Design a protein around this ligand. Sequence first.
Ligand code: ZN
Lengths: 271, 263, 263
Amino acid sequence: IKTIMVPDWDKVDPEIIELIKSGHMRLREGIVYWSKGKKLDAGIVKHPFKEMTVDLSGVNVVLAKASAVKQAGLSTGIILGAIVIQTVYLSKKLEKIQASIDKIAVEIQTQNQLFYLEKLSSYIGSVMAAHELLGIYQEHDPIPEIVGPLLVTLAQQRNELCTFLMKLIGWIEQGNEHAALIIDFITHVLDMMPKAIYIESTLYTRLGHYHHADTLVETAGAKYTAVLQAYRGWARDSYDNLLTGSNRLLTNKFNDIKSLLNSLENKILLG
Amino acid sequence: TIKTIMVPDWDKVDPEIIELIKSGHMRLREGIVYWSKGKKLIDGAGSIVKHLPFKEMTVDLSVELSAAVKGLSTGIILGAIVIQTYLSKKLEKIQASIDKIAVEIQTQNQLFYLEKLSSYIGSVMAAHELLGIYQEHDPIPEIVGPLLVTLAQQRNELCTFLMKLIGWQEHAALIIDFITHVLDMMPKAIYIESTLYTRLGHYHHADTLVETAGAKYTAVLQAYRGWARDSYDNLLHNNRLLTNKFNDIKSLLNSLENKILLG
Amino acid sequence: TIKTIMVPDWDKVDPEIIELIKSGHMRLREGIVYWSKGKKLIDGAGSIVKHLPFKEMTVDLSVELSAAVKGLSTGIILGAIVIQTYLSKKLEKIQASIDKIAVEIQTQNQLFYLEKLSSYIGSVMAAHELLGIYQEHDPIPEIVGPLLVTLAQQRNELCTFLMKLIGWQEHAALIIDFITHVLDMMPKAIYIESTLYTRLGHYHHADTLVETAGAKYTAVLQAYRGWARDSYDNLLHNNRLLTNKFNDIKSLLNSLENKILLG
Ligand SMILES: [Zn+2]
């Protein structure tokens, strides 16, 4: 049971709504702006919010489609993004990932851990700090000298994680149920990443760089999708060898892989 | 042992400013008076109201308990001591205990949390250095900004590390002393973080960050309390040592110093 | 005959602003509240404090004497009437009397003073126009500045002209009526000049200019008084006309309206 802030369209000028419908204006996190090449002489259009209640109980967060009285994917993505940015929904998943790290660190070979769990923990810390910074917010006082370096670190760590994440499947043959642990960990990290991308886009929007935010979502989502496709290929080539001569738990984890590949939540978050 | 700090000299402050502070229209942090959120009466863009005049004050560092005899002034002097002197000794002692703790948590294979903690020390120290330079010189946002990002990141990861420590004889005494002192350090570092925000002219950011970071610190503190309440009897020579450690825990749980620092 | 003016709506003003006005820290002119000279309490560069909220008020123009029943408010409403309505009629009547006065002063061979007076009318009118445009729109310094120079120049030369007129039957009645009405016009034009200064953000300039220009006006007025005291008996059908003219002189000499307009 949480209370978020959603755009109050009854207080929005109808011409703004019509220009949004025609594709001349776009929206990200309660801020309207001109679409690329659609401005009608430099520069932001307009920022009104009202309360909405959502019950965060393993609840399907996409709780949004039900909330359905006016103009569908647009408002659905609006409420999804509000849930991601304002609630503790992502904090619980980050703490779960840290718990998985804690458990995996004692179930591997010390020479095979190397430095990857450290990088994952650092990235989780950066995402937590970014969500916290999103929590402190003064609309009439931007903080570019802080949001800038934060976006830097977030971009570096996300790009690096994209390059070394699938490598971690090797930990299946490097134990000290184990394969299920590793697969679950990788799936949850991948499921978290689009939320972090959406946080990066929100931070870009807070600085007034809306087109930057759109393009960043596109390119980061492209790299993330490439990693997902590598994950899919590995699952296709390892399903039989893992479920024969090595039962219910691993099958549930492979089903979780398939659900990650068809995540409507991550599709909405990534445009 | 005798130190000299700068404190607001209210005899050089116009009484109308004092009054608007007492009416809640204005707030104060580390020598800066500013308008409260949504309480600005004049027409303008910023929120700064006044840079306070400073007088010298002698303190004896040999802390929450002599001055302020003429809640607000207590917090002012406490923050002045935290900023201008006290935390460096705590950080030195924390750094000194890192190796023996590494020995005791080696089987968890997450020693990098002790590296980052050390980095956190550096960061806090660097921050404490900047404020010193900023006692007579202008704050530089290209320097304060990245340091604030690093401080936030490392503070969040340190909270996760303390949670993992709680989740994991004399081994217990060593780890309990470590956890207690690291937790005790955190509110001062939060205060330093917020003072950097203030030096950048973001006073509302500073107040709200104290709120949020203190809530996270309080969540960790309550986890520590829950652990200490369910483990005191199953752990009792060394009995007196563990009893002193649990008394230190209870002192941290009711720390007036940290409650003042966290608002 | 019924006119509507904008007056400060004090029910929409924070009481602390009102209080700082009453303590002398802040002053007011035509909808603008600003810090008094050397009384600014906050840290800043400008002197602006507040743009007052405005309410509608009906007056009947058919003036210093109904409203303000809830010295300061009297001056506020008087200035609002001078700015937003009243002076135009006075200027029209002055312009209408210029030709007959030219006939009566032709032997002095300084009729250009009547040309400049006419220009002064234009200038004042143009100024009155700008303020109207400036009720909803931003003042433009490249427009207000040169007009202020012209207003100052023409006001000084008009004072010299009035002195020369004083230095120079029914001829007397005509010239006395002219002098009395021109002098009566001057304080309103001074007020308009100062309001232009206010619209440019130069409030202290406006107050000091009212002071200096009013001192010059008062010097001319006292010359007029000295002339009227030494000429009333040597000038007395037309006797009633001259008596009415001298009564108008005495009314101008004790004009509460002009004393309020000139501070
Ligand atoms: Zn390392």
